[PDB]
C-alpha cells in the first residue's frame, strides 16, 4: 500500500538489531561449540634446503564488531523516548527522500549492469578454459597434438617428456617473460640438482605445478591407448619428485646423503635397496662414503621406511557370482603386502587364508570398494627437493597382453596401511638369517595385508576362453619395487 | 543458436531498458 | 607440420629453374602418401578422441578443430587427386594404389632407419660399456 | 509435423559439473526473481490463490509467471495420456516436433492470455502505449520461457517451474517471519514479522515477563509459536523423506550387477496434495459463484451457504479446513468427517496416480522383464506378485501420511500452508538426492 | 630454402638449420626421384621387380652358404649387405605385402646369426623392430628374453617372458626362461 | 482396521535413516532452503525503496 518510512529513527534500529543478531548468533554458537604413522613428517624439514623452506613459507572479528554494534544500537534504543490501520515501513526516511534519493538507484543499476554481468562472464570464461582433470585447455590441446603426430619409432625417455612439459600454457601465465626452452633448462637444473641462481623462485613454482601436468599427460596417454608414454610419464614423475636422474642404479641414489662420484666409482653391483641391506650396518656406511654415524642413522631410517610391494593373491572377481561369465562386468582384486626392503620373504602358506577371501554379504557385494575405502591414507613422502609437501600415491593401470595397448584410464589409489613398516617389528631383518618366522615375537596375524581393487570398466568378451591381462602398480614418489604381473580371465560359462 | 550468456545479456538489457524508460519518464516531469 | 607446402615450393621452382618433370611426380606421390597416412591416422583416432571428449578431458574447441581437420584432409586428398589428373592424363586409378603402397613402404623404412639412433639411446640409458663388435665388457 | 525455424538454446555435449550447474541455477533464480519486482510502465480481479501457487504477481513484468508454460505442459500431458498423440519412442524426429510444438503453442497461448487480460483488465480501455505494454510482457514471457528451457537443458539442477514455485514458497515463509513492515492501529507501531517484532518488544517494552508472552501469542500477527511449529514440521517431514524399502536386485543378462531398487514412502509425493487442492479450489469457487448468483435454492443451500467470509451449514462447509484447536473442539463430527475425507482423497489419488502414470506394479514388473533384473531370493514369475504386495500399500500409506501432515500443519497454524511446505521440501530433496547419486560437492 | 641439382636431379636443402620432418621428406623425395629415374614406364605397376629380387636372393644365398662352411663372421656381413640392398634399391611403390615378408624372413636369419656370434644389443634392437612392426610369435619372445638377460635388464626380461607365456603358455622354453629370470631378479634384489 | 496393520508392517520393513545420514541430509537441505529464502527476501526487500523512488 502507501508505506510510511521511519522519520523519527524509532523503527529501523530494531530491524537492524534483528538483522545483525540473526547473523551473529549462529556464528557465536558454532565458535563456542567448535591413523597411519608418518615417520617422515619430522625428518623432511631436517634435510630440506633453506632456500626451499623460504619458498614454502612465502608462496573472527565479525563476531566482535557485531556484538559491539548490537550494544550500541541497544543503548541507542534505550535512550529513545518511545480507529483505522496505518501501514508503514521500517527503513529510515532520508534513505528514500533525502538528498541521496538518486544515489541509491544509481548504485543499484550499477550493481545490476556492471558487477553481475562482468563477473559472471569472467567466471564463465575462466571455468570454461579449464578441463575436468584440472589443467588448462591449451595444455591438453598441446598434449593431444604432440601425441597425435608422434612417431612410434622414437623411444620415450625423461628428456622427451620434459620437452613436452615445457610447452605447458600455464607456465606462460606464471612468467610471461620466460620461454619453453627456459622451462626445459630449469627442469633439467632441478632434476640434476643444479642451481638456477636467479630463477629459483620460478623453478620451485614450475616444479610444484608439474604434478597436475604430469597427471593430465598420463590420463591423455592412457586415453590414446599408449603404454610407453604412460610408463615414461610415471618414471618422469618419480624422477621429478625425488630430484635424481633416471639411471639403472637410482633406487640407491634417491637416498638423502650419498656422493655419486664415490659410490659409482667404488661399487658397481649394488643396484637396489635389498642388495644394499644385504651388507652390515657399518659396511653400508663404508660403501656409501658418509662415515657419520649421527648422519648414517638418518639414511638408515629413510632407506628402511619406503614401501616395497608384493602380491599375495591376484585374480578376477565378479560381484555376486563365483566364476567369470561371458559378457559380465568383473573387477580386479589385488592382495598386496607392503613391506620394507629389509624384511625377508614371508611364504604365502603362512597367511591364515582369512584375510584373502572376500565376505559374501549383500552389504559387501553391493559395492566391493566400501571395504577398501576404510584403509588409512598414505603418509607424507620423503621429498627433500620437492617444494611442497606431498602424500604418496600409487598409480595402478591395466593393459592387455594381446597387442600391448592400455584399455582404461589410470586409477590412482591413495589409501593404504604402512603398519608393516613401523619401528616396533624390527626384529624381522634379512641379515639375521635364522628363520625369523619361528620367532617368539613373530605372529602372522600382526602383519596387515592391504587390499587394492581396480574396476575393469569393460565387460568380459562374449566368447569362451582364457583372456590375458597385465596389471602395473608403480609408485609416484619413490623408486621402490613395483608390480608387473599377468592375469587371465577364464571365461567358462 | 543461442548461448546462456546471450540469454543473460538479453534479460539484463531488457531490465536495464525498462528501468531507463521509467527514470526518463520520471525526470521528464521534474524537468518539464 | 607437413610436406604439403614443400610440393608447392617445388612447383614454384619448376616454372623458374626449369626442373625435371619426374621430380614433380615424385613430390606428388609423396604428398599423396602423406595424405593417405594422415587420413588413416584420423580414421583410427576418431573413436578414442570422441571418447576422451565425451569423458570431458580434452576441451570443447579441440573436438570442433578435429572435426574440421577430418574434412580438410578429404579436401586436400581430392585436390591432390585433381592435380595428379591434371599432370598426367588418365592417371588416377593407379595414383591411389601407388600412394597406398608407398605410404606403408616409407613408414616401414622410417621405422627401420630409426633403430640407428635407438641403439645409442638404450646405451646411454643403461650405462652399458660396450667395446667394438658390439660385445659387453661389463 | 511442419517446418519451423525459431531460436533455442543448445544443450552441452558433455556433462556439466556440479559447481557450474549450481552457479547457473543461482543466477537464473536471481534474474527470475528480479523480473518479479519491477513494475510495468504503461500502467496508470484479485486472485491471491493463483498468484501464490503459479508464481505470479500483479502489476509486475512477471504477472503471467509460469502459468502459461504450465498450461501448455498440462495440455500436452493430457493429450499424451489420452493416447491421442500416439507418441512413439522409436523416432526422435517426432519427439523434436513435439518439443517445438510445445513452444509454438505456449507462445500463442501467451499472446491470447495477454490480449484478454489487457482488454478485460482494470488497466483502462484507452494505442502506442498499449502496444508498448504488450511488447514489455511479451519479451518478459519469452525471457522466462527461455530461462526455463535453459534450466531444463542441463545447466540447472532440474526443472524451472518447480524450482520457482519452491522459491516463492520459501519467500512467503521468510516474509511471514522477518517482515520489516509495520502497522499502527491505536496501540502503536508493531512489526509484521515474527522475529522483528519479537526482538522489538523484548527491547523497548522494558517488561520481560509480560513482553515475552505478549510477543509469543500475538493473536493477530505471526508469532514465535508459529515459527517453532513450522520449523518442527519441516524437520519431521525431512526425517520422513528417508523412509524407503530397499529390495535386493540382481541381473540375469549381464551377471554381476548388484544394486538396490529404492521404494520411498512418498511414492508420488507432489501429485495427490496438489490434485486435492485444485479440486477443493474449483469446488468452493463454483459454490461461491452459484451462491452469489442464486440468492436461495434448496440445492444451493444444501451444497453450501456462505456467511461471516466462510461457508457454513452445507456440504461445502465440511470441506473447509480447520483454523485452530478451537474449531476442532467446537464440532467434533466436522473434524472427523473432514479428516476422513482429506485422508481418503490423498489415498485414492495416490492409487489412481500410480495406476495411470505408468508406475503400476504391472508396469514395473514389465520394466524388470525388459531390463532382466530379478529379486535376490525369488523367482522370475514372482516379481509381479511381490510388487503387488509392496507398491499399492506403499502408495496408499504415503498419500495418507501426506494428508495427515498437511492437516496437522494447517491445524497447528504454521507460517505457510502444509501443501506448500511439503512441495518445497520435496523439490529440494529431489535436487539433493540427484546431486548425491551423481556425485558432487 | 632448397637447391635442385642438375646432373643428379636430387633436391637438397640449401638452409643450414633445417627441421627433421623436412629432412625426412626431402630424403623420401630423393628416393622417389632416383627410383622413377630407373623405372622407365610412366604407368608403373605395383608388381615388384624381378632382377632386384634375384640379386637379393643371390646375396642371401651367399650369406647362408657361410653357415655350412662354419664361417659365422662373413655371413653376418653378407646378410647385412643383402638387407641394406633390399631396403635401398627397392622402390617404395612395390607391393607392401610382398616386401614385408621378405624383410621378415631375412631379418630372422640375421637375428639368429647375430645372437650366435655374440652381439646382443644389435640383436635386441632388431627383435624390437620386428616385434613392433607386426609380428608377435613365441619364436621371438624367447630370443628377446635371452638377449635381455644377457645384457643385464631383468625387469623387462620378466615382462617379455610373461607376455610370451600369455600367448602360448604350453611352451617348454618360456617357463624355463621365466624361472631363470625370477632367480636372477631374486639375487638382484635379495 | 487392517490398513494400519499393513502400514505398520511396511514401516517396520522400511529402512529408517540413522543419525549420521540424517545430519548430512538436514545440513544440505537447510543450506539450500535458507540460501533460497534469504535471496528471495533480499530481492523482495531491496526493490521496495527502488519502486518508491523510481515509480
Contact between A456 and A489 under an 8 Å Cβ cutoff? The reply is no
Contact between D394 and F10 under an 8 Å Cβ cutoff? The reply is yes
Name A12's Cβ contacts closer than 8 Å, sequence gap at least 6: A6, A90, A91, A92
Contact between E166 and A401 under an 8 Å Cβ cutoff? The reply is yes
The Cα–Cα gap between E3 and D219 comes to 103
Q: What share of chain B is helix, strand, coil (3-state, %, to 5)?
A: 90, 5, 10
CA atoms within 13 A on the CB side of E85: 17
**Which of D400, D398, D393 shows the shortest CA–CA distance to D340?**
D400
The Cα–Cα gap between A95 and A149 comes to 67
Contact between D194 and D217 under an 8 Å Cβ cutoff? The reply is no
**CB-count burial class (<10 Å; 0-12, 13-18, 19+) for A421:** buried
Q: Which of A17, A83, A88 sits opposite D199 (nearest CB)?
A: A17
**Which of D110, D35, D32, D98 shows the shortest CA–CA distance to D71?**
D110
The Cα–Cα gap between A212 and A218 comes to 10
Give the total number of structural domains in chain D.
1
**Which of D208, D334, D342 shows the shortest CA–CA distance to D283?**
D342
Cα distances (angstroms) measured from residue E45 to each of C28, C90, C97, E36: 17, 15, 10, 12
Name A139's Cβ contacts closer than 8 Å, sequence gap at least 6: A167, A168, A169, A170, A213, A216
Task: Write down which residue in A244, A277, A303 finishes a domain.
Answer: A303
Tell me the angle at which helices E20-38 and C22-55 cross, rounded to the nearest 10 degrees.
Answer: 140
CATH number at residue A169: 1.10.3380
Which residue does chain D place closest to F48, by CA atoms? D37
Residues on chain E touching C136 (C-beta within 8 angstroms): 120, 150-151
Query: Are A370 and A485 in the same domain?
Result: yes
Which cell numbers in the block locate residue A146? 604432440
Which residue does chain A place closest to D377, by CA atoms? A362
Which cell numbers in the block locate residue E141? 619372445
F contact residues 16-45, partner D, Cβ 8 Å cutoff: 16-17, 21-22, 25-26, 28-29, 32-33, 35-41, 43-45
Find cell 578441463 and name the residue: A131
Contact between A344 and A317 under an 8 Å Cβ cutoff? The reply is no
Distance from CA of D180 to the nearest CA of B (A): 25
Give residues preceding each break in chain A, C–N over 2.5 A: 34, 59, 82
Name A289's Cβ contacts closer than 8 Å, sequence gap at least 6: A258, A259, A262, A263, A266
Q: Is any Cβ of chain A less than 8 angstroms from the Cβ of D17?
A: yes
Residues on chain C touching E120 (C-beta within 8 angstroms): 134-136
Q: Is any Cβ of chain D less than 8 angstroms from the Cβ of C56?
A: yes
Residue burial D313-339, b: 16+ Cβ < 10 Å; e: rest: ebebbebbebeeeeeeeeeeeebeebb
CA angle (D236 as vertex; D235, D239 as ends), nearest 5: 90
User: Which one of C22, C120, C133 makes the best mutation probe of the E interface by having the most chain E beta carbons within 10 Å?
Assistant: C22
Query: Are A289 and A378 in the same domain?
Result: no
The Cα–Cα gap between D102 and C132 comes to 83
Query: Are A454 and A333 in the same domain?
Result: yes
Phi/psi-derived region of residue E137, left when phi > 0, alpha when psi is between -120 and 50, beta in every other case = beta
Query: Are A263 and A320 in the same domain?
Result: no
Query: Are A279 and A363 in the same domain?
Result: no
Please report which residue ranges of A48-100 form alpha helices under DSSP H: 50-58, 61-79, 94-97
Q: What are phi and psi of A356, to 5 degrees?
A: -95, -35
Cα distances (angstroms) measured from residue A178 to each of A155, E15, F20: 28, 28, 52
In E28-124 the beta strands, taken as DSSP E runs, fall at none
Query: Are A236 and A331 in the same domain?
Result: no
Query: How many helices (H) and strands (E) are present in chain F, helices listed first?
Result: 2, 0
D contact residues 20-39, partner B, Cβ 8 Å cutoff: 24, 27, 31, 34-35, 38
**CB-count burial class (<10 Å; 0-12, 13-18, 19+) for A261:** exposed
Q: Is any Cβ of chain F less than 8 angstroms from the Cβ of D162?
A: no
Which cell numbers in the block locate residue A462? 562374449
Whether residues A108 and F48 touch (CB distance < 8 A) is answered with: no
Q: Quick check: is A476 in a domain?
A: yes
Method: cryo-EM
Give residues preceding each break in chain D, C–N over 2.5 A: 44, 126, 308
Residues on chain A touching E189 (C-beta within 8 angstroms): 272, 274-275, 481
Domain that holds residue C73: 1-138
Q: Quick check: is D139 in a domain?
A: yes
The Cα–Cα gap between A97 and A314 comes to 80
Find cell 540447472 and name the residue: D156
Whether residues A223 and C56 touch (CB distance < 8 A) is answered with: no
Which cell numbers in the block locate residue E84? 641394406
Contact between D292 and D286 under an 8 Å Cβ cutoff? The reply is no
Neighbour subunits, E (≥3 Cβ pairs < 8 A): A, C
| Torsion angle (degrees, nearest 10) of CA E32, E34, E37, E39 | -60
Q: Is any Cβ of chain A less than 8 angstroms from the Cβ of C64?
A: no
Q: Which of E132, E136, E188 sits opposite A271 (nearest CB)?
A: E188
Residues on chain B touching D100 (C-beta within 8 angstroms): none
Q: What is the largest CA-CA distance in chain C?
A: 64
Contact between A471 and A408 under an 8 Å Cβ cutoff? The reply is no
Contact between A463 and A456 under an 8 Å Cβ cutoff? The reply is no
Query: Are A322 and A453 in the same domain?
Result: yes
Whether residues D181 and A90 touch (CB distance < 8 A) is answered with: yes
Name A116's Cβ contacts closer than 8 Å, sequence gap at least 6: B12, D27, D30
Q: What are phi and psi of A314, to 5 degrees?
A: -130, 120
Which residue does chain D place closest to C56, by CA atoms? D14
Domain that holds residue A251: 138-303
User: Which one of B1, B3, B4, B26 makes the best mutation probe of the D interface by having the most chain D beta carbons within 10 Å?
Assistant: B4
Give the total number of structural domains in chain A.
2
Q: How far is CA A340 from the centre of its chain?
A: 22
**CB-count burial class (<10 Å; 0-12, 13-18, 19+) for D48:** exposed
Contact between D44 and D38 under an 8 Å Cβ cutoff? The reply is no
Task: Write down which residue in A244, A268, A303 finishes a domain.
Answer: A303
Cα distances (angstroms) measured from residue A210 to each of A388, A478, C69: 12, 16, 30
Our answer on whether B and E touch (3+ beta-carbon pairs < 8 Å) is: no
Which DSSP letter does residue D11 get? Answer: P
Query: Are A318 and A467 in the same domain?
Result: yes
Q: What are phi and psi of B25, to 5 degrees?
A: -65, -30
Which cell numbers in the block locate residue D311? 461457508
Strands D244-250 and D182-184: unpaired
Q: How many angstroms separate the first and last alpha carbons of chain B?
A: 45
Contact between A328 and A321 under an 8 Å Cβ cutoff? The reply is yes
Residue burial A108-144, b: 16+ Cβ < 10 Å; e: rest: bbeebeeebbeebeeebeeeeeebebebbbbbbbbbb
CA angle (A170 as vertex; A169, A173 as ends), nearest 5: 100
Contact between A209 and A174 under an 8 Å Cβ cutoff? The reply is yes
Which cell numbers in the block locate residue A194? 643444479
Give A130's strand partners. Answer: A136
Cα distances (angstroms) measured from residue D299 to each of D279, D294, D295, D315, E110: 20, 11, 12, 10, 112
Domain extent listing, chain E: 1-190
Contact between D41 and D133 under an 8 Å Cβ cutoff? The reply is yes
Q: How many angstroms separate the first and last alpha carbons of chain F?
A: 62
Over the Cα atoms of chain F, what is R_g? 22
Tell me the angle at which helices C115-126 and E121-132 cross, rounded to the nearest 10 degrees.
Answer: 120
The Cα–Cα gap between D324 and D330 comes to 10
Contact between A431 and A277 under an 8 Å Cβ cutoff? The reply is yes
CB atoms within 10 A of CB D397: 24
Residues on chain D touching C56 (C-beta within 8 angstroms): 14-15
CA angle (A459 as vertex; A453, A465 as ends), nearest 5: 100
Domain that holds residue D362: 18-177+228-438
Q: What 3-state class would DSSP assign to A417?
A: coil
Query: Are A434 and A385 in the same domain?
Result: yes
The Cα–Cα gap between D409 and D420 comes to 11
Give the total number of structural domains in chain B.
1
Which cell numbers in the block locate residue A251? 633406487
Name A230's Cβ contacts closer than 8 Å, sequence gap at least 6: A218, A221, A222, A397, A406, A410
**CB-count burial class (<10 Å; 0-12, 13-18, 19+) for D278:** exposed
Whether residues B23 and F54 touch (CB distance < 8 A) is answered with: yes
Domain that holds residue B19: 1-32
Contact between D251 and D257 under an 8 Å Cβ cutoff? The reply is yes
Name A480's Cβ contacts closer than 8 Å, sequence gap at least 6: A251, A273, A306, A307, A308, A309, A341
Cα distances (angstroms) measured from residue A224 to each of A145, A211, E12, F7: 11, 20, 36, 56
- The data reach a resolution, in angstroms, of 4.0
**Which of E147, E143, E140, E145 shows the shortest CA–CA distance to E158?**
E145
Contact between D383 and D375 under an 8 Å Cβ cutoff? The reply is yes
The Cα–Cα gap between D189 and A267 comes to 95
Contact between D268 and D354 under an 8 Å Cβ cutoff? The reply is yes
Give the total number of structural domains in chain C.
1
CATH number at residue A394: 2.60.40.150
Query: Are A333 and A432 in the same domain?
Result: yes
Which residue does chain F place closest to D44, by CA atoms? F55
Query: Are A154 and A288 in the same domain?
Result: yes
Q: What is the DSSP annotation of D377-396?
A: TS-STTHHHHHTTTHHHHHH
Q: How far is CA A253 from the centre of its chain?
A: 24
The Cα–Cα gap between A64 and D263 comes to 49
Residues on chain A touching B19 (C-beta within 8 angstroms): 109
Q: How far is CA A105 from the centre of its chain?
A: 50
Amino acid at each position: 500500500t502507501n508505506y510510511e518510512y521511519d522519520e523519527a529513527s524509532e523503527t529501523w534500529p530494531s530491524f537492524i538489531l534483528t538483522g545483525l543478531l540473526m547473523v551473529v548468533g549462529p556464528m557465536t554458537l558454532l565458535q563456542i561449540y567448535q591413523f597411519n604413522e608418518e615417520v617422515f613428517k619430522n625428518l623432511n624439514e631436517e634435510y630440506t634446503s633453506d632456500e626451499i623452506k623460504q619458498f614454502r613459507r612465502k608462496f573472527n572479528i565479525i563476531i566482535i564488531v557485531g556484538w559491539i554494534l548490537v550494544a550500541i544500537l541497544l543503548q541507542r534504543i534505550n535512550s529513545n523516548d518511545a480507529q483505522s490501520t496505518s501501514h508503514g515501513i521500517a527503513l529510515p526516511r532520508f534513505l528514500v527522500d533525502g538528498s541521496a534519493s538518486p544515489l541509491l538507484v544509481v548504485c543499484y543499476v550499477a550493481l545490476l549492469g556492471l558487477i553481475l554481468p562482468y563477473f559472471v562472464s569472467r567466471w564463465w570464461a575462466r571455468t570454461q578454459s579449464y578441463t575436468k582433470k584440472g589443467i588448462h585447455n591449451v595444455t591438453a590441446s598441446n598434449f593431444v597434438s604432440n601425441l597425435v603426430n608422434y612417431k612410434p619409432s622414437e623411444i620415450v625417455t625423461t628428456d622427451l617428456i620434459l620437452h613436452w612439459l615445457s610447452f605447458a600454457h600455464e607456465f606462460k601465465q606464471f612468467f610471461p617473460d620466460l620461454q619453453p626452452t627456459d622451462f626445459e633448462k630449469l627442469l633439467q637444473d632441478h632434476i640434476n640438482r643444479r642451481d638456477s641462481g636467479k630463477l629459483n623462485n620460478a623453478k620451485f613454482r614450475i616444479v610444484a605445478k608439474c604434478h597436475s601436468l604430469l597427471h593430465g599427460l598420463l590420463d591423455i596417454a592412457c586415453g590414446f591407448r599408449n603404454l610407453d608414454i604412460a610408463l615414461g610419464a610415471i618414471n618422469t614423475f618419480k624422477c621429478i619428485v625425488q630430484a635424481v636422474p633416471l639411471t639403472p642404479n637410482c633406487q640407491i641414489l634417491q637416498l638423502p646423503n650419498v656422493d655419486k662420484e664415490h659410490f659409482i666409482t667404488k661399487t658397481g653391483d649394488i643396484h637396489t635397496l635389498g642388495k644394499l641391506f644385504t651388507l652390515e650396518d657399518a659396511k653400508i656406511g663404508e660403501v656409501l662414503g658418509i662415515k657419520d654415524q649421527a648422519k648414517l642413522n638418518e639414511t638408515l631410517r629413510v632407506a628402511s621406511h619406503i614401501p616395497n610391494l608384493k602380491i599375495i593373491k591376484a585374480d578376477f572377481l565378479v560381484p555376486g557370482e563365483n566364476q567369470v561369465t561371458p559378457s559380465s562386468t568383473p573387477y580386479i582384486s589385488l592382495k598386496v603386502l607392503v613391506r620394507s626392503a629389509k624384511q625377508p620373504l614371508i611364504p604365502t602358506s603362512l597367511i591364515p587364508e582369512e584375510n584373502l577371501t572376500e565376505p559374501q554379504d549383500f552389504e559387501s557385494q553391493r559395492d566391493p570398494f566400501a571395504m577398501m575405502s576404510k584403509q588409512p591414507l598414505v603418509p607424507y613422502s620423503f621429498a627433500p627437493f620437492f617444494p611442497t609437501k606431498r602424500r604418496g600415491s600409487w598409480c595402478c593401470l591395466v593393459s592387455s597382453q594381446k597387442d600391448g595397448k592400455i584399455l582404461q584410464t589410470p586409477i590412482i589409489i591413495e589409501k593404504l596401511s604402512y603398519k608393516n613398516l613401523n619401528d616396533d617389528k624390527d626384529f624381522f631383518d634379512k641379515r639375521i638369517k635364522m628363520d625369523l618366522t619361528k620367532h617368539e615375537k613373530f605372529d602372522i596375524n600382526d602383519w596387515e595385508i592391504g587390499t587394492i581393487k581396480i574396476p575393469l570398466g569393460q565387460p568380459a568378451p562374449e566368447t569362451v576362453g582364457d583372456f590375458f591381462f597385465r596389471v602395473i602398480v608403480k609408485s609416484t614418489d619413490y623408486f621402490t619395487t613395483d608390480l608387473d604381473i599377468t592375469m587371465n580371465m577364464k571365461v567358462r560359462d | 543458436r543461442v548461448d546462456p550468456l546471450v540469454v543473460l545479456f538479453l534479460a539484463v538489457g531488457f531490465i536495464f531498458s525498462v528501468v531507463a524508460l521509467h527514470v526518463i519518464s520520471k525526470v521528464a516531469g521534474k524537468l518539464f | 607440420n607437413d610436406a604439403h607446402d614443400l610440393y608447392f615450393q617445388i612447383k614454384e621452382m619448376s616454372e623458374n629453374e626449369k626442373i625435371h618433370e619426374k621430380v614433380l611426380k615424385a613430390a606428388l606421390l609423396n604428398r599423396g602418401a602423406e595424405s593417405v597416412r594422415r587420413s588413416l591416422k584420423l580414421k583410427e583416432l576418431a573413436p578414442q578422441i570422441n571418447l576422451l571428449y565425451k569423458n570431458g578431458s580434452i576441451g570443447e574447441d579441440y573436438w570442433k578443430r578435429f572435426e574440421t581437420e577430418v574434412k580438410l584432409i578429404e579436401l586436400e586428398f581430392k585436390d591432390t587427386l585433381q592435380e595428379a589428373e591434371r599432370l598426367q592424363p588418365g592417371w588416377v586409378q593407379l595414383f591411389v594404389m601407388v600412394c597406398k603402397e608407398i605410404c606403408f613402404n616409407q613408414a616401414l623404412s622410417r621405422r627401420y632407419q630409426s633403430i640407428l639412433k635407438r641403439k645409442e639411446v638404450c646405451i646411454k640409458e643403461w650405462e652399458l660399456k660396450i667395446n667394438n663388435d658390439g660385445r659387453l665388457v661389463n | 509435423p511442419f517446418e519451423s525455424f525459431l531460436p533455442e538454446v543448445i544443450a552441452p555435449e558433455r556433462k556439466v559439473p556440479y559447481n557450474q550447474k549450481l552457479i547457473w541455477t543461482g543466477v537464473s533464480l536471481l534474474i527470475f526473481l528480479i523480473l518479479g519486482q519491477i513494475p510495468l510502465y504503461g500502467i496508470v480481479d484479485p486472485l491471491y490463490w493463483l498468484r501464490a501457487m503459479l508464481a505470479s504477481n500483479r502489476g509486475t513484468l512477471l504477472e503471467l509467471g509460469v502459468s502459461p508454460i504450465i498450461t501448455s505442459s498440462l495440455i500436452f500431458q493430457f493429450l499424451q495420456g489420452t493416447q491421442l498423440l500416439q507418441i512413439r519412442p522409436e523416432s526422435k524426429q517426432d519427439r523434436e516436433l513435439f518439443q517445438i510444438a510445445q513452444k509454438v503453442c505456449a507462445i500463442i497461448l501467451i499472446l491470447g492470455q495477454a490480449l484478454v487480460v489487457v482488454m478485460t483488465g482494470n488497466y483502462g480501455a484507452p494505442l502506442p502505449i498499449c502496444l508498448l505494454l504488450i511488447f514489455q510482457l511479451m519479451f518478459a514471457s519469452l525471457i522466462v520461457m527461455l530461462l526455463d528451457e535453459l534450466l531444463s537443458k542441463g545447466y540447472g539442477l532440474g526443472s524451472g517451474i518447480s524450482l520457482f514455485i519452491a522459491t516463492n514458497i520459501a519467500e512467503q515463509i521468510f516474509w511471514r517471519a522477518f517482515a520489516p513492515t509495520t502497522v499502527n492501529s491505536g496501540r502503536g507501531k508493531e512489526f509484521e514479522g515474527a522475529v522483528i517484532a519479537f526482538f522489538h518488544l523484548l527491547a523497548v517494552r522494558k517488561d520481560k515477563k509480560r513482553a515475552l508472552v505478549e510477543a509469543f501469542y500475538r493473536t493477530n500477527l505471526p508469532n514465535m509459536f508459529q515459527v517453532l511449529m513450522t520449523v518442527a514440521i519441516f524437520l519431521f517431514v525431512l526425517y520422513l523423506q528417508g523412509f524407503r524399502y530397499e529390495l535386493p536386485i540382481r541381473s540375469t543378462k549381464v551377471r554381476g550387477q548388484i544394486g538396490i531398487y529404492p521404494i520411498k514412502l512418498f511414492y508420488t509425493s507432489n501429485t495427490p496434495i496438489i490434485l486435492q487442492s485444485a479440486l477443493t479450489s474449483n469446488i468452493f469457487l463454483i459454490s461461491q459463484i452459484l451462491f452469489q448468483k442464486y440468492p436461495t435454492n434448496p440445492l444451493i443451500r444444501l451444497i453450501g451457504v456462505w456467511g461471516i467470509q466462510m461457508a457454513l451449514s452445507g456440504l461445502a462447509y465440511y470441506i473447509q479446513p480447520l483454523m485452530s484447536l478451537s474449531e476442532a473442539l467446537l464440532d467434533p463430527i466436522k473434524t472427523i468427517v473432514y479428516i476422513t475425507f482429506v485422508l481418503g482423497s490423498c489415498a485414492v489419488f495416490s492409487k489412481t496416480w500410480i495406476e495411470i502414470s505408468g508406475t503400476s506394479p504391472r508396469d514395473i514388473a514389465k520394466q524388470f522383464k525388459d531390463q532382466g533384473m530379478v529379486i535376490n531370493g525369488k523367482r522370475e514369475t514372482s516379481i509381479y506378485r511381490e510388487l503387488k504386495k509392496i507398491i499399492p500399500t506403499a502408495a496408499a500409506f504415503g498419500g495418507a501420511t501426506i494428508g495427515a501432515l498437511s492437516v496437522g500443519s494447517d491445524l497447528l497454524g504454521t507460517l505457510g500452508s502444509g501443501a506448500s511446505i511439503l512441495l518445497a521440501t520435496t523439490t529440494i530433496y529431489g535436487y539433493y538426492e540427484a546431486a548425491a547419486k551423481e556425485g558432487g560437492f | 630454402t632448397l637447391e635442385y641439382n642438375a646432373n643428379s636431379k636430387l633436391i637438397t636443402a640449401s638452409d643450414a638449420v633445417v627441421a627433421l620432418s623436412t629432412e625426412t621428406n626431402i630424403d623420401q623425395i630423393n628416393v622417389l626421384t632416383t627410383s622413377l629415374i630407373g623405372e622407365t614406364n610412366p604407368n608403373f605397376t605395383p608388381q615388384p621387380n624381378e632382377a632386384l629380387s634375384k640379386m637379393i636372393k643371390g646375396l642371401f644365398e651367399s650369406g647362408m652358404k657361410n653357415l655350412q662352411q662354419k664361417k659365422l663372421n662373413e655371413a653376418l656381413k653378407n646378410v647385412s649387405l643383402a638387407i641394406e640392398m633390399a631396403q635401398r634399391k627397392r622402390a617404395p611403390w612395390e607391393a607392401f605385402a610382398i616386401q614385408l615378408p621378405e624383410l621378415h624372413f631375412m631379418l630372422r636369419s640375421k637375428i639368429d646369426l647375430c645372437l650366435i656370434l655374440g652381439k646382443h644389443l644389435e640383436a635386441l634392437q632388431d627383435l624390437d623392430f620386428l616385434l613392433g612392426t607386426g609380428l608377435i610369435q613365441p619364436d621371438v619372445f624367447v630370443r628377446k628374453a635371452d638377449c635381455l638377460l644377457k645384457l643385464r635388464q631383468w625387469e623387462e626380461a620378466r615382462a617379455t617372458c610373461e607376455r610370451g607365456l600369455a600367448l602360448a603358455p604350453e611352451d617348454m622354453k618360456l617357463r624355463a626362461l621365466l624361472i631363470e629370470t625370477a632367480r636372477n631378479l631374486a639375487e638382484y634384489n635379495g | 482396521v487392517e490398513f494400519v496393520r499393513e502400514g505398520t508392517q511396511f514401516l517396520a520393513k522400511c529402512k529408517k535413516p540413522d543419525l549420521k545420514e540424517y545430519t548430512k541430509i538436514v545440513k544440505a537441505v537447510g543450506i539450500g532452503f535458507i540460501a533460497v529464502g534469504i535471496i528471495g527476501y533480499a530481492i523482495k526487500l531491496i526493490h521496495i525503496p527502488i519502486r518508491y523512488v523510481i515509480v
